[PDB]
Amino acid sequence: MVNPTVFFDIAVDGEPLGRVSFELFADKVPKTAENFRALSTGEKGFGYKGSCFHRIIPGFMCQGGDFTRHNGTGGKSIYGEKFEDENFILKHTGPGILSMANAGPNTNGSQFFICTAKTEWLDGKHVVFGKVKEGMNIVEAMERFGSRNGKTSKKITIADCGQLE
Amino acid sequence: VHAGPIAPGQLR
């Protein structure tokens, strides 16, 4: 086994900021990790390259992945528009946890969030499937452009993304 | 209608 490493190169108003890399827990959350991996490479025909982080709430999390509507309403998985919660074995234990954003039970699509804090209230409601491997400083930097209701000061995009390992 | 985790502020 070797878990995928995927990266996002973040751009703020078109100007590249830095890279955040993630290890995806494919050995424990295989279907959720494969969905994020294939959307990072774009091998199915659509994906994250170019999408923005539409919702950033400082001290909580940074959310993105809505590559169809760019506002929290769209996105689709490689499986169909929505797929089921695979399991809840992993918890939201601290900053850097990568988890599925959803609109209730069994509504996984392509949106995801990166916790910048331990968020125990999300356990059992959002499937954790990865963690930041390097670039946590870039995540902290992204936070400064968010607001209490999640709106961003600047246009935060995924300039490029793909799979390293 | 908009997806995503519920914020601390939405809870209190």
Side-chain angles (χ1 to χ4, degrees), chain A, chain B residues 1-10 12:
Chain A
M1 172 258 286
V2 179
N3 275 343
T5 293
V6 291
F7 72 94
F8 288 173
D9 282 338
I10 306 303
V12 174
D13 275 288
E15 204 48 43
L17 173 62
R19 177 166 294 170
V20 182
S21 297
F22 314 98
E23 178 192 335
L24 302 181
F25 303 133
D27 63 315
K28 290 174 187 70
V29 223
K31 179 175 178 225
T32 308
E34 181 50 25
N35 178 65
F36 189 92
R37 190 205 59 69
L39 293 170
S40 290
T41 68
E43 59 190 77
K44 298 300 161 273
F46 48 90
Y48 295 134
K49 191 176 191 156
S51 66
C52 62
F53 279 76
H54 63 280
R55 185 181 180 227
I56 298 182
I57 296 173
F60 179 34
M61 65 74 239
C62 301
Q63 180 186 335
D66 184 353
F67 65 82
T68 58
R69 299 300 204 255
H70 309 281
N71 61 19
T73 62
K76 41 152 59 287
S77 77
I78 65 164
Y79 305 114
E81 309 326 278
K82 299 307 157 183
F83 68 100
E84 51 289 350
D85 290 316
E86 186 175 12
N87 59 64
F88 295 105
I89 296 170
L90 305 169
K91 318 263 267 87
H92 296 77
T93 50
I97 292 294
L98 176 67
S99 184
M100 288 308 283
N102 62 42
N106 305 302
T107 58
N108 294 299
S110 58
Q111 297 184 54
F112 64 84
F113 58 99
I114 307 163
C115 313
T116 54
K118 190 191 92 201
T119 59
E120 131 289 316
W121 64 98
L122 299 180
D123 295 335
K125 304 205 62 141
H126 292 277
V127 181
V128 172
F129 64 94
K131 61 173 191 281
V132 174
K133 196 183 180 177
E134 112 285 286
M136 204 57 231
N137 61 315
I138 299 303
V139 180
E140 301 170 84
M142 284 174 78
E143 294 216 278
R144 286 190 308 274
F145 303 104
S147 58
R148 292 247 272 246
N149 69 120
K151 291 329 302 144
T152 59
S153 284
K154 289 208 123 288
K155 180 187 58 197
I156 311 311
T157 52
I158 297 172
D160 194 21
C161 52
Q163 184 174 355
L164 294 181
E165 307 145 57
Chain B
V1 295
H2 289 268
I6 310 308
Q10 295 165 247
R12 46 106 253 270

